[PDB]
Ligand binder design. Sequence first.
Ligand SMILES: O=C(O)C[C@@H]1CN(c2ncnc3[nH]c4cc(F)ccc4c23)C[C@H](CO)O1
Length: 167
Amino acid sequence: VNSFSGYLKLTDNVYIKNADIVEEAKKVKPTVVVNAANVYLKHGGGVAGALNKATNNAMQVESDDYIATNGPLKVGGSCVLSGHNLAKHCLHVVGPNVNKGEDIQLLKSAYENFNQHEVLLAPLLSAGIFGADPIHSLRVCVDTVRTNVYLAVFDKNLYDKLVSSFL
Ligand SMILES: O=C(O)C[C@@H]1CN(c2ncnc3[nH]c4cc(F)ccc4c23)C[C@H](CO)O1
């Protein structure tokens, strides 16, 4: 039993809710919240900008030190950093950005990072400003992630479409 509430169950291990991931993280305090990161960990907008704003920019300060030490992430890659006031940990995962011409096949690699964590609160990777089709992202998620993932979908209209079209 865990503390996630109001989710629709899609599969054995994937759950979905119309929710603001920031508000969900603050209420749940999950062990892991996933950020929709870019390779530079520049958290300017979308999910990343919202999450970073909720940390009062502490996420960005920590991220800048990470990049100065380690250099950029790979598209499809990830790193574990602090969850600040939102979660114990933040798993920063880089899905391909269609608006930069990155290969959508890397979306599966991105979701594979979730399998290193038993339970996660996450957005749909490569959705929103990353330009991928969220219906496709959900399909890849269900077909790749084996651990327990709680998906927060900000847009109610999109949430209803994801549920109604789910095979
Ligand atoms: O679909 C859309 O219209 C945009 C969404 C945005 N993003 C989010 N996901 C879940 N929680 C979110 N809280 C936010 C607060 C913000 F200020 C900006 C974005 C989010 C956000 C990912 C999905 C992928 O499908 O796309």
